[PDB]
Amino acid sequence: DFDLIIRNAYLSEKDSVYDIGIVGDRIIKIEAKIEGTVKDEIDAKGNLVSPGFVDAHTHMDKSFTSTGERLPKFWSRPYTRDAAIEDGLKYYKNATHEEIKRHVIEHAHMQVLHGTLYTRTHVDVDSVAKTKAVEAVLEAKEELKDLIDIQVVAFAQSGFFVDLESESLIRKSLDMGCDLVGGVDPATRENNVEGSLDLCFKLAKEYDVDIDYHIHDIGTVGVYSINRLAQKTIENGYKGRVTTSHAWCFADAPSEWLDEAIPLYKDSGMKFVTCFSSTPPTMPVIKLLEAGINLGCASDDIRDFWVPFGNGDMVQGALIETQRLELKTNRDLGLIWKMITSEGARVLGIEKNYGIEVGKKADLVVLNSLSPQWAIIDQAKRLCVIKNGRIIVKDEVIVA
Amino acid sequence: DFDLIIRNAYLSEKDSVYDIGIVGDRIIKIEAKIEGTVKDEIDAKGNLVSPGFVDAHTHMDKSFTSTGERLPKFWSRPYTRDAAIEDGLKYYKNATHEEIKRHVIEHAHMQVLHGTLYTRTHVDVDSVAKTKAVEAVLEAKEELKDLIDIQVVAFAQSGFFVDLESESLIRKSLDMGCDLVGGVDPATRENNVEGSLDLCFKLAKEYDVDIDYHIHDIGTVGVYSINRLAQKTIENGYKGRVTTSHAWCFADAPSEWLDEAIPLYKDSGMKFVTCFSSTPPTMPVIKLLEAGINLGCASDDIRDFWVPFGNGDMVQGALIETQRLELKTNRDLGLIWKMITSEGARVLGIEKNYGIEVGKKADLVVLNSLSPQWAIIDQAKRLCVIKNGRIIVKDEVIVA
Ligand SMILES: [Cl-]
Ligand SMILES: [Cl-]
Ligand SMILES: [Zn+2]
Ligand SMILES: [Zn+2]
């Protein structure tokens, strides 16, 4: 019979309560009542059971570097991208393989305590970090495979045309086994939009990897950089293989620029990720989703020299998004929930095995709340977390 | 001898770790090490101990009315003030004294679990509620005297010049013992700014009570309404006795209007409350505080037909404000912390007995975090809550 049954699980997509039967790492049966009994059971008690949350953009390598003292380190100054880059170069100067590795494990545990079972982390690759951070992350990734699936982005944080050693280092990193490649700000960092982008596509083709680009530039220069990225996506036959992270520019650029760009994004299969530690309040999130653009959600940095905040909790991030974007209706909170779940899945390219349906992966979160909406509102802690059909978290403890 | 000693308490205002000695409801000794006998002790273990949080604007009477189903009630339609007023009139048509009372105690317990020991609630007074809600709240207030101090605003939710029965009903309500009086939107609700305000000042003088006004109107009409309120504050000799809640208008009105109004606000001793369930993202919070304007913070409604959110947790609210306003520096998170503490106290008029100083009330919160900043960031649960020198909360349960 079953390896695991979840009793009395409210499923949002079906709007009813079901027993869930699991064998190995797969969901086999979803029924109003499953008969009769097996060794491992979890009673969800009428509360929501959800697939694992998806944190589509993190920086596990540099997380928790702000911790250590009474006040967060690094935060006696305001945030600016270039200064945050410089703090990274100091930090990476003499950080050891093991300090990074432990940060990554710490990060993952926190995430998984909150029911995130899938994440895509960017890792700094530049002339100071070299491939040291890539090494530590790949190593930790391997150790964490029973807790959390990780996609790794070889991330040229300093700029391909600013730090001229980046190209060969990204090349090593991808050969070490990073799963995607990405740059930062073609325009205001690189000062070369065509060049930075072409180089990124070249590297992606050499190693047959997907792309995740950090585009922070605000306004029309940001929309323009994404437009170029999207057009080159088509030219290079990379439809559906490119993610644009942040895209804060959609918030202040004229709405017309977005209206005109949307068919291009749909035609290029452009994917986006908005991080709840920075989503602009006038970000047209709802509009993007209603237009059928694939928009995921994410923590971004956690407790470092870019972002002091962070608990790796996508349910807390959903609440933050509702506040940033002033959402209140059940429909809208419902859309945000999709963003931390199935939209993130699609961004990650795992949609086929993702969801609470027969045949899907037994990667689940049993919550202490009645519905997506109530979970966002009441912020109750996770009751149970299940990965590969095995219970890995039970009542605030990693039991794996 | 002490009735209570808190060991190893990090105090933000002193930036060091101290023992806190308490007798009855008072702090009597603060010292690096307190030798002496003692009945009860709490070890804060190097973590931050803070005074009780101040939730300067709530609506305890209608709270939790959204609860009951799988999805929040009322949230199949978006929010507009007038529609919310209409849901209240339906709700209040059939609500019983006991229902309201229970909502108020639930609300208070929740607040207190999170270390709020002081709150100002508004209570709907209009031709449907009549004084029923005032009755339930005053009764509950009495029962809750050992957990939380409550100020009650007789609040003319429907408008003095719209619901004509409001004036006599507010009179009764103040005679029943409400501590302040308040209206809503002189301009777009009442359609009479001079009249609505003069009437309010009239009722305040008859019963010698302070004023708390809901001003939601956006833009210049909002600034104008507050300017008239502030000028009439001076004319009526009510300096320091008037609070403006919300003032969303400061966010979209031209910055010049605020610049010119600031001396008037200082001159009138105008107090403000921003609620974290609605603070506009471009609200000039930092600017107000730097100018020495007294700005408190608050939950506003909790789980009702105005706001579906709510946990009565001012530490969670502080995180939300950092996100709404995009704050990250230690200095700014510090200012937000003042807003949920000492600024709220000053809005309430209790600043003299408020704080962790010798002679002050023994109303305290022992946290599981190192500092104001880390508390906002890590959102750790409260370790211990102390009111009137007695432990009322210990490990997520009310032990009073
Ligand atoms: Cl170019
Ligand atoms: Cl008028
Ligand atoms: Zn990033
Ligand atoms: Zn209000």
Author numbering:
A (entry chain A), B (entry chain B): 4 to 403
What does the report in the manuscript say about this coordinate set?
Trp309 has been shown to be motile in the comparison of the ligand-free AtzC structure and the inhibitor-bound structure, suggesting that this amino acid moves upon substrate binding.
AtzC is a member of amidohydrolase protein superfamily and is the third enzyme of the atrazine mineralization pathway. AtzC is a tetramer, according to PISA, our SEC data (native molecular mass of ~210 kDa), and previous reports, with the asymmetric unit containing half of the tetrameric structure. The second and larger domain which contains the active site is a TIM-barrel fold. The active sites of the independently solved structures show similar architectures, each having three histidine residues coordinated to the zinc ion (His60, His62, His217; 2.1 to 2.3 Å) as well as Asp303 (about 2.4 Å) and a water (2.0 to 2.1 Å) bound to the zinc.
